[PDB]
């Protein structure tokens, strides 16, 4: 299975951001380096679109961390309740 | 809260607009002036939006919404199926009973949405919304339990109670200060008829008819078995039988469905369909206070 | 097969006690119990209707009226 | 997962880009870019790892509380 479209768009956004950042500190040789970096970005986009992965669900990159925190809290609450139950 | 707002909206949508005013008269959570600010002749969307505005002007909570749902259930009391629980083995008080029941249900797992509403004839109606250890109790799958003070019987609507039945039973029996709690196999939808049954609170002389003795005997037997009083409105019956053939026992399973039972059964003998004395399996439905039967050889 | 006595009055235990044997005592006892319940209810609703003037809150009453709880102000 | 496959591809692409480029300042910028993105990618891989670990643990304590 090809790469998930959400992952592709996320990765493309990160490549755009990093290319803007690496262009910010470049003063001279702007046009040639930006053309080369654009070619690099498009070749990477083609490679990642063509790339194949086994059918494993992989959720959005940004939100997962937050989920973990909530999940952690859930377990804590569960543990607390468990303790209370055992106490009873 | 938006959850209570949409819950109230759904309950109002369940309420027919022809009696919404009565609901407010039974709800009384909102001031009468707020009711006057809303006309009921206008559109349904308009009236529900105005009611949302009114409840948002005040502080919308879960207790008032649950009370509204309870009173809607009271006015309908026809949309659910009821089962009857019996307690067995003398001082009562509303406040401590409520406190004990609330404490037990809070101790159940961690929380539950419990609401009480006293009604005439000592009919405490309790709305219970269940929730797991890691989720807020759901308001879309509620249950209702009706308790009568100092009585050995209680009523329950079983829509999703099959998930955790013993919990409710043990909570009810510990709150009622009663030891043994059992479920009799009696299930029906007309709750008022259940109330009645559990408490036992219910010319052209040229023609020369022949066999008139048979007609007068069958009508007399039917009248003595049933009676002049209007029979309780019961709607479903089912017998599970396993008896020897006598004609390896045959296992039979019958279901009687009728919008008005005990009346077609009352008319079977006059219509000649069944014998003059009906079998005890049909003549003791109000007597034995039993609705589902099992028969063996 | 039919009765009008309210259910919260205990009779089935009294039925197992004296309904089969010594029916006269059964009837006398149930008469006493119903009379007591009626007197309690009459006192309760007489208080509610008449002397509510000096009462400051509703009285909590059980169907059998074994327990009564109320509050009152006297001047 | 998907990342477990795209990171080796990203490593090989970074290697070939570093090999082809000749400017020292561009080489340093590309190296810093690679370090940052590799750190973020391995961080989110770890986050998904404890994500599935927390899911399994949640199921276990669900059975326990039941």
Q: Residues of chain B whose C-beta is under 8 A from some C-beta in C?
A: 90-95, 122, 148-153, 199-202, 287
Neighbours of chain C (3+ CB pairs under 8 A): B
Q: Output the CA torsion B103→B107→B108→B110 (10° steps).
A: 120
In angstroms, the first-to-last Cα distance of chain A is 51
How many other C-beta atoms lie within 10 A of the C-beta of residue B221?
Answer: 16
| Residue-wise burial string across D36-59, b where 16 or more C-beta atoms lie within 10 A, e elsewhere | ebeeebeebeeebeebeebeebbe
Query: Which residue does chain C place closest to B197, by CA atoms?
Result: C2
Instruction: List Cβ neighbours of D1 (8 Å cut-off, separation of 6 or more).
Output: A53, A56, A58, D45, D48
Q: Is A78 on the interface with B (CB under 8 A)?
A: yes
Which residue from B150, B139, B12, B158 is spatially nearest to B84, judged by alpha carbons? B158
How many angstroms away from the CA of B107 is the closest CA of chain D? 13
Phi, psi for B116 (deg, rounded to 5): -115, 150
- The continuous run of DSSP H or E covering B64 comes out as helix B62-76
Which among B131, B134, B135, B163 is the top mutation candidate for probing chain D, defined by the most D β-carbons within 10 Å of its own β-carbon? Answer: B134
Q: Would you call C71 an interface residue with chain B, using a CB distance cutoff of 8 Å?
A: no
Which chains pack against A, by 3+ Cβ pairs within 8 A? B, D
Q: In chain C, positions 4-23, which contact chain B (CB-CB < 8 Å)?
A: 4, 7-8, 10
Positions of E strands within chain B? 82-88, 113-117, 123-129, 142-148, 153-157, 180-188, 236-243, 250-257, 292-296
B92's tokens? 């009562």
CB-side neighbour CA atoms (13 Å) of D56: 6
- Contact criterion met (CB < 8 Å) for B93 and C69: yes
Chain D residue numbers touching B134 (CB-CB < 8 A): 62
Give, in order, the Cα–Cα distances in Å from B105 to each of B102, B114, B190. 5, 8, 28
Residues B265/B278, Cβ–Cβ less than 8 Å: yes
Cα angle, residue C55 at apex, residues C54 and C60 outer, rounded to 5°: 160
**Bridge partners for B116 per DSSP:** B126
Instruction: Name every chain D residue with its beta carbon within 8 A of the beta carbon of A75.
Output: 54, 57-58, 61
CA–CA distance, B169 with B151 (Å, rounded to integer): 15
Q: Which of B11, B5, B6, B45 is nearest to B27 (CA)?
A: B11
> Residue C8 is nearest to which of B94, B95, B150, comparing CB atoms?
B150
Selecting from A3, A22, A85 the residue whose C-beta is nearest the C-beta of D29 gives A22
Angle at D48 between CA D42 and CA D49, to 5 degrees: 85
Instruction: State how far the Cα of D43 lies from the Cα of D50, in Å rounded to an integer.
Output: 11
Residues 6+ apart with CB under 8 A from B155: B82, B83, B84, B85, B145, B146, B191, B194
Separation CA B256–CA B265 (nearest Å): 10
Residues in D touching A58 (Cβ below 8 Å): 1-3, 48
C73 touches chain B (CB under 8 A): no
Q: Where are the alpha helices (DSSP H) in chain D?
A: 2-20, 24-65
**Which residues make Cβ contacts (< 8 Å) with residue D16, sequence separation at least 6?**
none
This PDB structure is determined at a resolution in Å of 8.9
Give the residue on D whose Cα is nearest the Cα of B134: D62
Which two tokens mark A1? 């299975």
Q: CB A78 to CB B133 under 8 A?
A: yes
> What are the CA-CA distances from residue B227 to residues B155, B197, B219, B262, B263 (Å)?
27, 15, 11, 11, 11
Q: Within an 8 Å CB–CB cutoff, is residue A73 touching chain D?
A: no
Phi then psi dihedrals of residue B87, to 5 deg: -110, 150
Which residue has tokens 């009906």?
Answer: B278
Q: Which of B90, B92, B151 sits opposite C7 (nearest CB)?
A: B151
> Touching check for A81 and chain B: CB below 8 Å?
yes
Q: Contact, B150 vs B90, CB < 8 A?
A: yes
Say if C and A touch: at least 3 Cβ pairs within 8 Å.
no
Contact between B53 and B35 under an 8 Å Cβ cutoff? The reply is: no
Distance from CA of D53 to the nearest CA of B (A): 18
3-class secondary-structure state, position B219: helix
Which chain B residues touch C69 with a CB distance below 8 Å? 93
Which positions ≥6 away from A68 have C-beta within 8 Å? Answer: D47, D50, D51, D54
Which one of B106, B108, B111, B134 would you mutate to disrupt binding with A, by most A Cβ within 10 Å of its Cβ? Answer: B134
Alpha-carbon gap, residue D40 to B17, rounded angstroms: 58
């Amino acid at each position: 299975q090809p790469l998930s479209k959400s992952t592709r768009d996320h990765l493309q956004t990160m490549m755009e951001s990093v290319i803007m950042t690496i262009l910010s500190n470049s003063i001279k040789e702007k046009e040639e380096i930006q053309y080369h970096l654009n070619f690099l970005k498009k070749r990477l986009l083609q490679q990642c679109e063509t790339l194949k992965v086994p059918p494993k669900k992989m959720e959005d990159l940004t939100n997962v961390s937050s989920l973990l925190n909530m999940e952690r809290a859930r377990d804590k609450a569960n543990e607390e309740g468990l303790a209370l139950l055992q106490e009873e | 809260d938006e959850t209570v707002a949409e819950f109230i909206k759904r309950t109002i949508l369940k309420i027919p607009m022809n009696e919404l005013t009565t609901i407010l008269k039974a709800w009384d959570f909102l001031s009468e002036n707020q009711l006057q600010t809303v006309n009921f002749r206008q559109r349904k969307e308009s009236v529900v939006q105005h009611l949302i505005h009114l409840c948002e002007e005040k502080r919308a909570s879960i207790s008032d919404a649950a009370l509204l749902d309870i009173i809607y259930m009271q006015f309908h009391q026809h949309q659910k199926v009821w089962e009857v629980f019996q307690m067995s083995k003398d001082l009562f008080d509303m406040k401590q009973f409520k406190n004990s029941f609330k404490k037990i249900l809070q101790r159940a797992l961690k929380n539950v949405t419990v609401s009480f509403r006293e009604t005439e004839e000592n009919a405490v109606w309790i709305r219970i919304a269940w929730g797991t250890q890691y989720t807020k109790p759901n308001q879309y799958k509620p249950t209702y339990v009706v308790y009568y003070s100092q009585t050995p019987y209680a009523f329950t609507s079983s829509s999703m109670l099959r998930r955790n039945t013993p919990l409710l039973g043990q909570a009810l029996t510990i709150a009622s200060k009663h030891h043994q709690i059992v479920k009799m196999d009696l299930r029906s939808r007309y709750l008022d008829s259940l109330k009645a049954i559990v408490f036992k609170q219910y010319m052209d002389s040229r023609i020369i008819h022949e066999n008139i003795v048979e007609k007068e005997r069958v009508q007399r037997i039917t009248q003595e078995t049933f009676g002049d009083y209007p029979q309780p409105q019961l709607e479903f019956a089912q017998y599970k039988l396993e008896t020897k053939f006598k004609s390896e026992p045959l296992r039979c399973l019958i279901k009687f469905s009728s919008p008005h039972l005990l009346e077609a059964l009352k008319s079977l003998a006059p219509a000649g369909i069944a014998d003059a004395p009906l079998s005890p399996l049909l003549t003791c439905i109000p007597n034995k206070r039993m609705n589902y039967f099992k028969i063996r050889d | 097969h039919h009765h009008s006595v309210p259910v919260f009055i205990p009779l089935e235990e009294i039925a197992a006690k004296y309904l089969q044997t010594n029916i006269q005592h059964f009837l006398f006892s149930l008469c006493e119990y119903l009379n007591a319940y009626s007197g309690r209810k009459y006192q309760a609703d007489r208080l509610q209707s008449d002397f509510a003037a000096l009462l400051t809150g509703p009285l909590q009453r059980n169907p059998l009226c074994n327990l009564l709880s109320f509050t009152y102000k006297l001047d | 997962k998907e990342l477990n496959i795209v990171l080796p591809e990203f490593e090989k692409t970074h290697l070939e880009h570093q090999q082809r480029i000749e400017s020292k300042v561009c080489k340093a910028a590309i190296a810093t870019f690679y370090v940052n993105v590799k750190e973020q990618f391995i961080k989110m891989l770890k986050e998904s790892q404890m994500l599935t670990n927390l899911k399994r643990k949640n199921a276990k304590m669900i059975s326990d509380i039941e």
